[PDB]
Amino acid sequence: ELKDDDFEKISELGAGNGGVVFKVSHKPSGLVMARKLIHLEIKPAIRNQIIRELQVLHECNSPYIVGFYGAFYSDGEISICMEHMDGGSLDQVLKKAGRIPEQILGKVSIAVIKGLTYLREKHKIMHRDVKPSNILVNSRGEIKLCDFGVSGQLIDSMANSFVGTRSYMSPERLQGTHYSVQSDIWSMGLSLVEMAVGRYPIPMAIFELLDYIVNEPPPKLPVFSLEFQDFVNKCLIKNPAERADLKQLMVHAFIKRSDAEEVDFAGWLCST
Ligand SMILES: C#Cc1ccc(Nc2c(C(=O)NOCCO)cc(/C=N/OCCO)c(F)c2F)c(F)c1
Ligand SMILES: Nc1ncnc2c1ncn2[C@@H]1O[C@H](COP(=O)(O)OP(=O)(O)OP(=O)(O)O)[C@@H](O)[C@H]1O
Ligand SMILES: [Mg+2]
Predict the structure, then answer these.
(1) Gene Ontology cellular component?
(2) 1-85: which CATH architecture?
(3) For domain 86-272, which architecture applies?
(4) Alpha carbon of 261 to ligand 2 centroid (Å)
């Protein structure tokens, strides 16, 4: 029940490849929500299938997944209306914070591996694009995941995804088609490491960045705590089967001392 005209544009939270979200007002309910607009050059049939498989998001309910209000089509634009996250993305936070704690990243990590196990064990789907620009947090202290693959057809229309300048892509997934869930870990790994070093931990046009990632060894860290090495790295193992699976890390030592401890996060964000 969300039509294009019951929407009033306020600003522009951000953009990217094919997408571009805005902060908008749903005129008829007064609610403030983020309106993603993917474009994609697709036909009516495939499109309707994308708009259809996107309804699954009404059953994607968890403190770790961004809230979703509706999805629909309008002028070559697939709209995905999700909750507004005033606190932006752990990417934006970065750009304005040089680097992030650990007592904190241990919290941003519980978010992620609890939101991944959710998507994997209640919707049988892997994220497939977990990274900072896709990890959002709110002023209320919450941390949630967004932009995950929920529409198989949307994942097929996004085939030309090896563009950009960075790449949270695991090695086995850059080599060919031998990959799945374990790939999300290398992603989260290459994230935690970047949210501890204020810059893409790797080490050059993308064709060369890719080749490098599969050839030489995975990043580590510069200076940094305990487990945040025996975790950031149990995440960067280039062999997918030797890397740690969610089950494991959900009991790993770094995680051990964290949901146990009591960091605020809220205030840190609110004042960072
Ligand atoms: C809550 C919630 C929520 C969950 C998901 C999305 N959006 C996507 C995006 C998505 O939005 N990606 O951002 C790009 C658009 O600019 C990409 C894919 C496809 N994956 O194919 C590329 C990986 O190989 C997909 F299937 C999606 F459903 C969302 F907007 C909100
Ligand atoms: N619910 C939301 N609330 C507030 N900001 C959001 C929300 N969803 C996405 N954003 C922000 O909107 C912007 C665009 O997101 P988008 O997914 O299109 O780009 P991206 O993830 O940065 O890059 P890419 O297209 O390569 O994945 C980002 O700056 C992101 O943090
Ligand atoms: Mg995103």
Answers:
(1) axon; cell cortex; centrosome; ciliary basal body; cytosol; dendrite cytoplasm; early endosome; endoplasmic reticulum
(2) 2-Layer Sandwich (3.30)
(3) Orthogonal Bundle (1.10)
(4) 30
Q: Which two tokens stand for residue 98?
A: 């040089």
What Å distances lie between residue 36 and 45, 146, 229, CA to CA? 21, 11, 36
Q: Which token pair is 158?
A: 């996004």
Q: Nearest to residue 271, comparing CAs of 143, 87, 103, 12?
A: 87
3 state DSSP class of 209: helix
Question: Do residues 57 and 71 lie in contact, with contact meaning Cβ atoms separated by under 8 Å?
Answer: yes
Q: Where are the domains of the chain?
A: 1-85, 86-272
> Quick one: DSSP state of residue 148?
-
Number of helical (H) and strand (E) elements in the chain, helices listed first? 10, 8
Neighbours of 71 (CB within 10 A): 24
Q: Could you tell me if the CB of 130 is within 6 A of ligand 2?
A: no
Is the distance from CB of 163 to CB of 206 less than 8 angstroms?
yes
Interstrand relation of 14-15 and 31-38 (parallel, antiparallel or unpaired):
unpaired
Which atom, in ligand 1's list, is nearest to the CA of 18?
Answer: 16
Tell me how far the alpha carbon of residue 112 is from its chain's centroid: 8
Q: Where are the beta strands (DSSP E) in 75-180?
A: 77-83, 135-137, 143-145
Q: Ligand 1 pocket test: which of 148, 153, 160, 163 has the largest number of ligand atoms within 8 Å of its C-beta?
A: 148
